[PDB]
Design an enzyme around this catalytic site. Structure first.
Site, PDB file in Angstrom:
ATOM      1  N   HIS A 111       0.832  -1.218   0.000  1.00  0.00           N
ATOM      2  CA  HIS A 111       0.000   0.000   0.000  1.00  0.00           C
ATOM      3  C   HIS A 111       0.868   1.271   0.000  1.00  0.00           C
ATOM      4  O   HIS A 111       0.328   2.387   0.031  1.00  0.00           O
ATOM      5  CB  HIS A 111      -1.057  -0.034   1.119  1.00  0.00           C
ATOM      6  CG  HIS A 111      -0.545   0.109   2.513  1.00  0.00           C
ATOM      7  ND1 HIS A 111       0.209   1.198   2.930  1.00  0.00           N
ATOM      8  CD2 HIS A 111      -0.734  -0.665   3.605  1.00  0.00           C
ATOM      9  CE1 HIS A 111       0.488   1.064   4.216  1.00  0.00           C
ATOM     10  NE2 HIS A 111      -0.092  -0.068   4.657  1.00  0.00           N
ATOM     11  N   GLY A 155       3.077   6.168   9.424  1.00  0.00           N
ATOM     12  CA  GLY A 155       4.481   6.085   9.022  1.00  0.00           C
ATOM     13  C   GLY A 155       5.185   4.873   9.626  1.00  0.00           C
ATOM     14  O   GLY A 155       6.345   4.614   9.275  1.00  0.00           O
ATOM     15  N   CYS A 163       4.109   1.824   9.265  1.00  0.00           N
ATOM     16  CA  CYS A 163       3.915   0.617   8.427  1.00  0.00           C
ATOM     17  C   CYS A 163       5.256   0.094   7.904  1.00  0.00           C
ATOM     18  O   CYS A 163       6.135   0.914   7.673  1.00  0.00           O
ATOM     19  CB  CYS A 163       2.915   0.839   7.303  1.00  0.00           C
ATOM     20  SG  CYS A 163       1.226   1.106   7.906  1.00  0.00           S
TER      21      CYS A 163
END
Ligand SMILES: C[C@H]([C@@H](O)c1ccc(O)cc1)N1CCC(Cc2ccccc2)CC1
Ligand SMILES: C[C@H]([C@@H](O)c1ccc(O)cc1)N1CCC(Cc2ccccc2)CC1
Lengths: 306, 306
Positions: free
Chosen positions: B41, B143, B145
Site C-alpha cells: 500500500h 508512518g 507501516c
C-alpha cells in the site's frame, strides 16, 4: 494507535557489551573507547561478598588477571583502576562501535531501558524506572551484573545504570557509570532493606493523558482539585507529593488534550479512592507509573534516532 | 531475580530497516540481501485506500518511482514485484548487515518483538503476541507501516510480522514476510471488525509458573481439576480451550517447580472465579497472557545470542 511499554532500540549498546572474567567470576562490562567498565565485585569470591575489602582484594590483581572478551576476540588489558564501585579496565584497542554517549546520574521517577546480558551476550531489553526508594524492578539472574541502563536522544547514548546487586526482597540495586550507587546500597552481602516503594505521581498522570489520547477515557470525571488537596490523598496512598514543577512538566500533555492538570489529578484521586471496579486503562488493571511525561510525548509523537 | 516483559535485542533488525517513499507516501521497508520488503500500500494515496486495485496501481510504477534510503544513502532499485500484500524491491547492493534469518508464519498465542520505526529509523522495541483473533495490540502511528515482528534463536532472525493496518478499534493487523495477512484482514480501508479477543490460556499458566519461580505464590491452592472441567470454566471467561498438547508444553515448568499442570489450572480457575481481590502477581493486577512457556524458560534461564 495504541500505547506500549517500549525500550529504546538496543543495537548501539549491544555493540559495547563484553565479558569480564576475574578468576572464577564472570560478568558483563561496557566497552566505550579504550575503557571497559564493570562492577568491582568481579574480583570477589562468593565468600568475599559478606565483608569484602576491595582495595585489599585489588592489590592481588594485575592487568593480566582481567580476561576481557568481545564476542570471540580477546582484548588486551594495559591498565586498571577502581572508581567508587566500578573498575575501569584500560584496553589497547578503542571499541570501533563506540556510539556517541554520555554518563548521566538520573533522578528517581526517571525511566530508562536495560539491556540484560549474560557472558557479554545480550539476552533481552526492557523499560525500567528508578524507584523513589532508589531500587529498580528488573529481571536479573546470576551473571547479569554489569548490564547497563540507558537513554538515547537521537544519536547520543546516555548511560545511567550499571547492575550490581539483588536485595533479599527480589528488587535490584546498582550504580551510575562513575560507580556511585543509587540510594544507600553497597556492594556487600548484608541486611539492606528497601524503603517504601512510593508511586511516581507525575508518571501516573502522564500515563492517564496517554490513555485519553488513545481512547480510554471512562475515568475522566466532572471534578477538579488543588495541589494541596490532591496531596492529602496522595500521601494516604503512598504517592509522591505533586509539585508545581510536575504540573509545569505536564503542561504539554495538558495543552494537547485540553484537560487541565488539576482536572486529571481529580480523576486520579477518584481512581485512588474508588479503585478501577475491574475496568482497565491501556490494558492495565492498576495505575502505571513507569512512563515519564517525556516518554508519553515521544511514543505518541514517534521520535526516532541515528 | 524478577520477571519482566522483555523484547529480543533489536540491533540485528535495526541494521535492516530502510525508508521507502513512492510519490507522497513514506513508510518502512526491510532490507535483507539485495531485496527490500515493504507493504504494497506504499503505492496508494489516502483516497486509493477505500477501494485500491493494486495490480492496476502498480502498472503506473517503475523501478525509479521507489525511493529507497538506508540511513543517508540511496539504494538503486533494479527490479520490483508484488507478492500477495508485499512489494519486493530488488536493489543492486546486498545489505552488508544482513543477519542470518528466516521467514516464519507464526500461530496465534505466539509472541514476538516489534521494532517500531518511522522514516526507516528505529523508535523503540516491545513484545507482542498474535492474538487468537489474528490481531496484535501494538503501538503504531502513521508512518510505522513496514515495521517488522521477529524472534531470534541464538544467531538466526525469524521474521514473522510486517505492520500494515490499524482497525477502527485501535488494534493492528499485518502480514507474514510472504505478504499474507494473519487472519481475514485486507489492506483496504473498510469495515473489518476483530473477532472475540480470547485469552491465551497456555501463556497464562506459563506466567503463573514464572510467578512461583520468583516468589509470588499466594494463588497456589489445595485443589486440582481435569482438562474437561477446567475448560468449562475457561469457555465461560473467553479463554482458549486447553489441550493435552498445551499440558505437554508446560511439562518442563511443571517439572522444575513440582507443581502439576492440572494443579496450576485449579489455581487459574480460582483466580477466574474469585478474581485477585486487589492483590498482584509479578506486579500485574490481571492475568498476563503474552508470555509463552518458551518465553518463561528463556528469561528464567538466561539464554543469549550472536
Ligand atoms: C497526539 C499526537 C502527537 O503529536 C502528540 C502527542 C503528545 C503531545 O504532548 C503532543 C503531540 N498527534 C499525532 C498526529 C495525529 C493526526 C491524526 C489524526 C487523525 C487520524 C490519524 C492521525 C493526531 C495526534
Ligand atoms: C529456575 C532457574 C532456570 O534454570 C530454569 C527456569 C525454568 C525452567 O523450566 C527450567 C530452568 N534456575 C536457575 C538457577 C538457580 C540457582 C540459584 C539458587 C539460589 C540462589 C541463586 C541461584 C535456580 C533456578
Amino acid at each position: 494507535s495504541g500505547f506500549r511499554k517500549m525500550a529504546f532500540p538496543s543495537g548501539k549498546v549491544e555493540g559495547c557489551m563484553v565479558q569480564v572474567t576475574c578468576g572464577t567470576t564472570t560478568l558483563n562490562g561496557l566497552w566505550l573507547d579504550d575503557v571497559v567498565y564493570c562492577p568491582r565485585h568481579v574480583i570477589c569470591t562468593s565468600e568475599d561478598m559478606l565483608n569484602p575489602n576491595y582495595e585489599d582484594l585489588l592489590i592481588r590483581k594485575s592487568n593480566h588477571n582481567f580476561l576481557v572478551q568481545a564476542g570471540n576476540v580477546q582484548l588486551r588489558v594495559i591498565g586498571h583502576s577502581m572508581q567508587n564501585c566500578v573498575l575501569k579496565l584500560k584496553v589497547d584497542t578503542a571499541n570501533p562501535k563506540t556510539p556517541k554517549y554520555k554518563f548521566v546520574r538520573i533522578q528517581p521517577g526517571q525511566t530508562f531501558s536495560v539491556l540484560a546480558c549474560y557472558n557479554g551476550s545480550p539476552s533481552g531489553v526492557y523499560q525500567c524506572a528508578m524507584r523513589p526508594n532508589f531500587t529498580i524492578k528488573g529481571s536479573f539472574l546470576n551473571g547479569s551484573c554489569g548490564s547497563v541502563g540507558f537513554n538515547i536522544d537521537y544519536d547520543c547514548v546516555s548511560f545511567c545504570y550499571m547492575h550490581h546487586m539483588e536485595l533479599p526482597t527480589g528488587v535490584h540495586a546498582g550504580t551510575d557509570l562513575e560507580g556511585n550507587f543509587y540510594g544507600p546500597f553497597v556492594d556487600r552481602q548484608t541486611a539492606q532493606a528497601a524503603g517504601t516503594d512510593t508511586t511516581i505521581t507525575v508518571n501516573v498522570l502522564a500515563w492517564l493523558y496517554a490513555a485519553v489520547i488513545n481512547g480510554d477515557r471512562w475515568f475522566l470525571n466532572r471534578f477538579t482539585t488543588t495541589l494541596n488537596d490532591f496531596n492529602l490523598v496522595a500521601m494516604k496512598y503512598n504517592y509522591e507529593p505533586l509539585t508545581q514543577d510536575h504540573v509545569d512538566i505536564l503542561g504539554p500533555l495538558s495543552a494537547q488534550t485540553g484537560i487541565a492538570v488539576l482536572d486529571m489529578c481529580a480523576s486520579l484521586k477518584e481512581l485512588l479512592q474508588n479503585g478501577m471496579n475491574g475496568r482497565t486503562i491501556l490494558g492495565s488493571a492498576l495505575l502505571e507509573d513507569e512512563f515519564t511525561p517525556f516518554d508519553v510525548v515521544r511514543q505518541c509523537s514517534g521520535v526516532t534516532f541515528q
